Amino acid sequence: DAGHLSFVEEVFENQTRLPGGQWIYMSDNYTDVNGEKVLPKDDIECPLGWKWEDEEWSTDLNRAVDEQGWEYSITIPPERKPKHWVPAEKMYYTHRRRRWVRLRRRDLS
């Protein structure tokens, strides 16, 4: 009767490559949207008092991403990481990432 709070947790799975190379897995390769590291999606836990509403993590194909959910970029000095992502793969693109989301909630009473 008091309602609930809702929060969609968002994390990004990251891959890199050398031009002419292949897309490859890394260690802890998960970051937030700005590229700062975070736990791998499957290790993420609700804060105390919260519960998952979605049973599974999902990736949203309506955003500007390809058919597998990836968006693409390259690192342009002076920067040390990609800043601008695009939906379409091209041979000179060296980074890609995929956005995973999951809804959790907290009942207010």
Author numbering: 943 to 1051
Task: Give verbatim lines from the article.
A single dataset was collected in a different space group P212121 (orthorhombic) to 2.2 Å. The crystal packing is almost the same in the two forms, but the distortions of the perfect cube in the orthorhombic structure means the monomers of the crystallographic trimer in the cubic crystals are no longer identical. This leads to some of the flexible regions (eg residues 965-671) being more visible in some chains with the orthorhombic data. The structure is highly conserved between independent copies in the crystals. The crystallographic trimer of the P213 crystal superimposes onto the trimer in the P212121 asymmetric unit with an RMSD Calpha of 0.89 Å over 326 residues of the trimer. The four individual chains from the two assymetric units superimpose no worse than 0.79 Å Calpha RMSD over 108 residues for any pair. The biggest variation between dysferlin models is between 965 and 971 and 1018 and 1021. These are also the regions with the highest temperature (B) factors in dysferlin, the regions with the largest RMS between NMR models in myoferlin, as can be seen from the CING database, and the regions that differ most between dysferlin and myoferlin. The trimer (with 9 phosphates) is predicted to be the stable assembly by PDBePISA. We have no evidence from gel filtration or NMR spectroscopy (data not shown) for the existence of a trimer, nor is there any likely way to invoke a trimer in vivo.
Mutations in dysferlin, the first protein linked with the cell membrane repair mechanism, causes a group of muscular dystrophies called dysferlinopathies. Dysferlin, a member of the ferlin protein family, is a type II anchored membrane protein with a single C terminal helix buried in the membrane. Dysferlin is not a part of the dystrophin-glycoprotein complex, but its function is linked with calcium-activated membrane repair caused by fusing aggregated intracellular vesicles with the sarcolemma at the site of injury. One DysF domain is inserted into the other DysF domain, by gene duplication, forming an inner DysF domain and a two part (N terminal and C terminal) outer DysF domain.
